[PDB]
Design a binder for this molecule. Structure first.
Ligand SMILES: CC[n+]1c(-c2ccccc2)c2cc(N)ccc2c2ccc(N)cc21
Ligand SMILES: CC[n+]1c(-c2ccccc2)c2cc(N)ccc2c2ccc(N)cc21
Lengths: 276, 276
DNA sequence: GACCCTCCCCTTAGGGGAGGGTC
DNA sequence: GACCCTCCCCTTAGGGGAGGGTC
């Protein structure tokens, strides 16, 4: 009342660090009422402690410091408004994050499936859920000459909506009795969608579509140039032996086992085709 | 395939800035496959573009860069785990924020009431909702000698739970036919609670309680030392004239109209008492 | 002894230059 | 011409010292 608080006093009283008070002083957000012309010691009054309330609350909600300066100068009505601003900014952060919880949750579901592989290199028939995907005409591309860059445009579309880029790389081609790799060309290349958020101004050359719900003859394995083709062969054979009727392209997905530059790269390949 | 991408090429392809690639290089998160010993130009392969997926997704969810380095080295199972970590960290952020939406919403409701004052300086009788509060025995304090520092301990308790410090400052005293200020002493001083989150290890000397739901004889005004007492007088008179029966202490709240150091300080005073 | 002062260095993830040199 | 290089300065909100000087 009729004396001042030293810095340490204020700091214990308002639960704000000395360093912070000192800094709040440098920026002129909150200044000691008095500074001893000799010692440079900061001294504060009791009445001024109340200006800290605003500072602490705004800090708590994450208002930048230089905004608080603008905030101090408000009568209630205008400060009421100010708060609705903070509210809608918090709702955005909420929507953003809840979207994010759902996405990761899904990314996870997809990882689990690809570690619960029944076995590698043998053919399974399984019942699959729909997978939404964006795809593009693969303009004469195939296994021997497709690049990561081929996917770039698709990826830009996905990332803009989903946020989460990392995924598998897909392509499709016709089920034929192929007798070598060079014999084969992809129909479409594609990548899966994870969200249900409208894609911004998608352009004609992309197609939003799905790998439909159905029974599927599958084969999955860890990639090796040798095994690519010979595994497809198993799949062809499997189908011929059981006289199954195929009802879609061959769908091939490729997904990195890891993303380390320090280790040898390695991929999971999965090839599936729908049967009746 | 049999050549490299320059930096600008990669940047267009992965939608990552040159500055970022350059930086990701400085930290060894992602390094060009080749650097021209003469020009220092960075050159990248197609195969390596895939390491960016992880980088971009993790960046999207806000993993610090130095964590991504640890993240790259994971097989799927361990990376699955990693993701559940990210999930629970997102839930915390969600709980935090949703708490925050509710708090501000309330802070707002309270501001509206104190701008919908029916009029200042005249007495109203109104029906009030409960207000939860923490209070402490005011050890002989009163109007003439209470400080902001008096509230400090209460405030520490509130802030630890609510996050939001800024509020009104309350006190209570006995309804007597006072004939001067020095005649009066506060019973308890208090501050309102905003959350319903358990207060951490509150200590006996605090009381969690409320200003109960009821009818109340009120008077509110903008503070002036003169008007403090004379307004109380109106309230006493009001009650005597209508022979009302009082059923609680006088509750006094004080709230800053603004938090500017640059303007003259100014307070709203509200004095209310419960009647049957 | 305890408290306070200034000044200097640190962390994040780059963006915006300037002034080279290179495709 | 357009692209790329290095190096230097910038923003946030302080925390952790060191080496004074002061309660
Ligand atoms: C789908 C083709 N394909 C092959 C491949 C398949 C058969 C023969 C030769 C290469 C490949 C081979 C190596 N080593 C490394 C990466 C990839 C790859 C990477 C992405 C992608 N979308 C397709 C990819
Ligand atoms: C409730 C008392 N009171 C009075 C006051 C009331 C009557 C006579 C003299 C001072 C006050 C007067 C001025 N100028 C500035 C701040 C305050 C204040 C601030 C906080 C608080 N909790 C109580 C406060």
């Amino acid at each position: 009342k009729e004396s001042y608080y030293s810095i340490g006093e204020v700091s214990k009283l308002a639960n704000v660090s000395i360093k912070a008070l000192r800094y709040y002083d440098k920026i002129d957000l909150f200044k000691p009422a008095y500074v001893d012309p000799d010692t440079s010691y900061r001294y504060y009054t009791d009445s001024q402690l109340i200006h800290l309330d605003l500072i602490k609350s705004l800090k708590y909600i994450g208002t930048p410091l230089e905004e608080m300066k603008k905030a101090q100068d408000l009568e209630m009505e205008e400060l009421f408004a100010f708060y609705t601003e903070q509210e809608r900014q918090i709702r955005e952060k909420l929507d953003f994050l809840s979207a994010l919880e759902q996405t990761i949750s899904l990314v996870k579901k997809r990882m689990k499936r690809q570690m619960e592989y029944p076995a590698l290199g043998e053919v399974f028939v399984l019942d699959e859920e729909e997978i939404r995907i964006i795809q593009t005409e693969a303009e004469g591309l195939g296994p021997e000459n497709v690049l990561n860059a081929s996917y770039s445009k698709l990826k830009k579309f996905i990332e803009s909506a989903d946020g989460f880029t990392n995924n598998s790389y897909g392509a499709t081609f016709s089920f034929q009795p192929y007798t070598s790799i060079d014999e084969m060309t992809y129909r479409h290349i594609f990548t899966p969608v994870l969200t249900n958020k409208q894609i911004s101004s998608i352009t004609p050359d992309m197609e939003i579509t799905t790998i439909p719900k159905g029974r599927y003859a599958c084969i999955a394995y860890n990639f090796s140039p040798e095994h690519y083709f010979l595994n497809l062969q198993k799949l062809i054979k499997y189908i011929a032996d059981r006289q199954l009727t195929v009802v879609s392209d061959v769908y091939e997905l490729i997904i990195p086992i890891h993303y380390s530059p320090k280790k040898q790269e390695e991929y999971r390949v999965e090839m599936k085709i729908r049967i009746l």
